[PDB]
Subunit: 387 residues, 4 copies
């Protein structure tokens, strides 16, 4: 039951199942995986595709001949399995040169290098068929207040993204960009810390249509925010270009648990939203099998990501299709929320005594919302306990 | 020393010093204050002005004659003291009718009433000389996932703000709107939970130039975010129309401590930013004297808000003016951060071997940022411990 | 299905279903309930009993004749329904006199009054058959560092609890005390903020056997802690005298959602622990039906607390009884965790070359824990998705 | 000014200034330091001593001859500088063998090895003159609910600490143990997550007098708790055997900022408490110079830890010595808090009409606490803004 197929568009980063287990306090617990191994194993589990940072696929500093051989082997694995590559990204965070940032490093020479590193990888992403290019500015930020003038840093970040937009336009590429917010870690505070801040920034770019967001479940939850609500705002703005699925237990370091772990009810409401809205992008997992696991546990954890999505999809669909739930949604006036407040227009509203002088505020205030019954129907559906 | 004057544009809500001390668990500890009393006492402390919700100035449900008398007495107090009213707002949160929201209530009749209540108060705000009209949507949100379709709620919130913009345009008013984000409390999650989400929303309004943000120190800190960073993004966007100053100890219920309490170093960096950027708006305090205090403690707490701002202003100015700090800022390359990455343009960057093939990444990575020395100079200046 | 019966020992505070809906920003949305009404309605839902603060049952300041009549009516309702009263507590937080504390108020006269108020209610609790007397020191704490010397406050808190222990001993009562920790709210920081701090304090009382803890789900989660882990430590110490069940979404104000809401997987692990350990006390709900609800929603929310406990009980029992789970627990060495490290004793351990010189650390480190497979079996059982 | 001397008992872990800068996302930015270098540089800054994990001083897996040479070189550096070694600890977290724990690993062979590794290092600590042996159980915990039975884990943790107590008793050593709590990171939840939980656990050991706590500023703040309050409880219990000083910005990953950074006002109240209580132990810094820094920034950051302690010590002493503050403390009844509630005894309290029938609750409730004036005097003293 709940068996994933490529149809479900489940994707995984090479760095997810390939995470060797090094953490702030501990050495690696697993050997490095050849990307070819990961592609073949993920395909066997029913994944649709993989994603990569440049330096996951091509060791940093590789010669041109080494780069070609790494890409050739990877493409053979994709061809052997039918796996796709819908998204790629640049590693602008691991190498010590990026310790103060890539695009917003105080040192101008580093900013220029970061752009050139990204541009090289955009070319590769396009050659592999990627539709989306993600940017996670994990080093953009500060541990202290004097270190980073945020207005200047935002100017530099806009300049960088505008140059990348000029680049893809000039080459005729169809790829689009997706900015991944995170509030903190590894920097004390990271620039563009939430979906909202990223959406706001995009509106000030020269070609805003080329940019959207790549929200990650656990990153919004590291600020204690409601991930489904933030996804709703991204959808409302037309900017949900990609998504990163995982789990998180609240306000902690970025745990990258398998999807469904962490906040299970938020996972339910997320799947309900994505499916109801008809989100058509990859269901991408940015997770880490815990370092306690051997490789059998790696593949079990990856399989669990997909399984949990499919269980939640079934339960959310049953919730929405249940005539008792539909009645409860009407009892709670969800239908009214979807109707305009004043399609009659401003003057008619100002002239409408039913909206002020003759509005019976105490009668209105007496009406219960019936939200608790609705929520218990949702709980019963999630748990398969209807009756 | 540190004596405030009206020149400093310090303002206070009537509901701040007038808070009677009722909390989730406790009855009022102070009698209600007449707004006339608050105006006269605040003026004696050196405040510039006050702000109000409709229902702070005019008891809910007052007749027209009662409304006129309350406003007349208030205006006499303003005239007697020279106090101004730079900002006003609507209470769309206390009355039970607003239990599911004002502008985004599921019930359409409530949404229409909320708009009419706001419009009536915009007229009054203009008559009192206010430049800014704040909206704090404290009831807009949910405790459960099925109760509120966030895309529909954002449609209703946009409709409401668009109607208010049509209204002020039609009346020829110069007032502008400022949206106050908050992540949670009293709703489990509130819509537009951060400065970023509010900035992003504004960009989708029909007349975005009429709307900005009113960020509150403690509200951003309730999501664990960096308040100075968020203010920098608002300034970068040209949207810092007003600000609410207070203190907060991290991720808790909204404490509304006096300004300078809570995160003292964030208060220092905030004042540094506001003064450096030339922010010209009110320095408004949205705080609550703790319920442990009698009226002498109320006025002591209000005086402390202003005193702490003025101490921090002195220390931040001394930091920026110190030639040793200026040298440390150059050592940390803050000057370079402010210079364009690639004013030479995209093609020149692509052709520049110094940005890629000839970039010595290990030499770059070896350079220290010297941020710790800079931050200790900042600490020494804040504490008055230079030497 | 999942129908509660008095056998299940589900109990509710009068103040839970009776909460009128006043919050930091909003007036009451529901009329006050007569305790007689609440007893009869809860009995109809299958509750076992109720609990009370003194001032929930007897209005503060009542005369002796008024007190007798309120108690008589309540006892008739209990007799009419078969409902029990297993626990009672004192309200040392609502009245303004308690603004700086009860037992740890700086004012000595208030501390003495708080003790007398509690002692009067212990007598009543015993007359009603209560086995446990809870103390929630919600006003014990501070908003500022100079206001409360914590060593002195702990001396006063120990003195108070020691006097109460002397009192019950002297009267021959069998009741025991349960201290309810909370980290903050309504005070900026509350003394004894977690289960651990309360357990540690109890060990320094003169008669520690008379005192245990009353942990509340949401209070531990307000510090981001793992509630099942804290309950395990309380059980390990022999100190889980009572428990408060509810839901919470992480690090926020105390939400008091119905049980099962908030962190659903933590609720599953909690029920698994309570049932596995054979906890025999009341399953008490300290929750608040949201202020959006009318009375039908109040009773729906209360019914949901019990329903969710019973669903989780079924799922946790099925998890523990499944031979595949039992095999996975052995694969993860949960059996070994339960066996002594060195029953052979210290000298034998020191002499055992297999514990040092001949321990193959790399072979040990290569063994996977198989925790992800185990956790996915747990998820499948919780969701009823085995297969 | 503020120049540290060995008299001040400032100490640093080898792993602090020696941190190479590897984080969850980034490679090392600094070369490894020879412990001899660190001892000599710290001495030049005015430190009193250093501390070590076994594997900081002796590379894991060293032969006996290699171990002797590493210790000999270190002891020569200590002799050359006058630096002391007051504390040592075991690394039971870095090596992959400890991925599920040391003392509470599910695998019994690992638990036995962890004990033998610790015992070997206790012998070395004693030879170097250490008075305290710290245990930080950073791997004791879980990412999932089924992986770790916490009651069984606490049994194993008690067994381990009891064996270590038997060991030191049997060898006649004067060293004592200090348990360092942390709530999470690197495990999803760590056992004994706060000072309170550790204090409670110690009370159940066979020889509790041999064990205390080593609280760390940032670890308590990762649960949003008040660090000075927790230190007060440890002092009240007689269990503050050692302390780790650093900074933290709230509920995040463990930042290990220099002391004084993060929550500056909490640092002030901590120093006030330690000095007022006469804490006589090391002032130990467990911090990490940010990875942005070169070695000059490492030593600047270490110097800043000590400088900030000394500034705060001066300001707290001036606060306590100021006759205006002493008057404000009396106005706020801090003197009364320190006096027994009922030295007259239980019967006299029960017979005292002034404690109940004749207690004027409204007159008591009208008295203001004057805490805001007191706190503003504290702010003025911290900032050196008295006047
Ligand atoms: Mg629709
Ligand atoms: Mg500039
Ligand atoms: Mg057992
Ligand atoms: Mg004393
Ligand atoms: Mn992540
Ligand atoms: Mn991601
Ligand atoms: Mn606020
Ligand atoms: Mn505000
Ligand atoms: Mn609660
Ligand atoms: Mn409770
Ligand atoms: Mn730490
Ligand atoms: Mn430490
Ligand atoms: Na700039
Ligand atoms: Na979209
Ligand atoms: Na709509
Ligand atoms: Na602006
Ligand atoms: Na005392
Ligand atoms: Na127990
Ligand atoms: Na055991
Ligand atoms: Na002590």
């Amino acid at each position: 039951n709940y068996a994933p197929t490529p149809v479900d568009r489940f994707t995984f980063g090479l760095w997810t199942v390939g995470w060797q287990g090094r953490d702030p306090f501990g050495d690696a617990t697993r050997r490095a995986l050849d990307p070819v191994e990961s592609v073949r194993r993920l395909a066997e589990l029913g994944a649709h595709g993989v994603t990569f940072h440049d330096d996951d696929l091509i060791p940093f500093g590789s010669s041109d001949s080494e780069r070609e051989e790494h890409v050739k082997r990877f493409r053979q694995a994709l061809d052997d399995t039918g796996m796709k590559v819908p998204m790629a990204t640049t590693n602008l965070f691991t190498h010590p040169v990026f310790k103060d940032g890539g695009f917003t490093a105080n040192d101008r020479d580093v900013r220029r290098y970061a752009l050139r590193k990204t541009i090289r990888n955009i070319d590769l992403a396009v050659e592999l068929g990627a539709e989306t290019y993600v940017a996670w500015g994990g080093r953009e930020g500060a541990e202290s207040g004097g270190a980073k003038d945020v207005r200047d840093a935002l100017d530099r970040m806009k300049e960088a993204f505008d140059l990348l937009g000029e680049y893809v336009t000039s080459q005729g590429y169809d790829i689009r960009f997706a900015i991944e917010p995170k509030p903190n870690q590894p920097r004390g505070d990271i620039l563009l810390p939430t979906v909202g801040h990223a959406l706001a920034f995009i509106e000030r770019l020269e070609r805003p249509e080329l940019y959207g967001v790549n929200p990650e479940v656990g990153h919004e939850q590291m600020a204690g925010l409601n991930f489904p609500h933030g996804i709703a705002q991204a959808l409302w703005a037309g900017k949900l270009f990609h998504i990163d699925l995982n789990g998180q237990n609240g306000i902690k370091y970025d745990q990258d648990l398998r999807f469904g772990a962490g906040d299970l009810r938020a996972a339910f409401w997320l799947v309900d939203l994505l499916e109801s809205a008809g989100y058509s992008g990859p269901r991408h997992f940015d997770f880490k099998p815990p370092r306690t696991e051997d490789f059998d546990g790696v593949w079990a954890s990856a399989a669990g990501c997909m399984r949990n999505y499919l269980i939640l999809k079934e339960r959310a669909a049953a919730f929405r299709a249940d005539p008792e739930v539909q009645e409860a949604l009407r009892a709670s006036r969800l239908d009214e929320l979807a109707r305009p407040t004043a399609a009659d227009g401003l003057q008619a509203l100002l002239d409408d005594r039913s909206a002020f002088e003759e509005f019976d505020v105490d009668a209105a205030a007496a009406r219960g919302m019936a939200f608790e019954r609705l929520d218990q129907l949702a709980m019963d559906h999630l748990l398969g306990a209807r009756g």
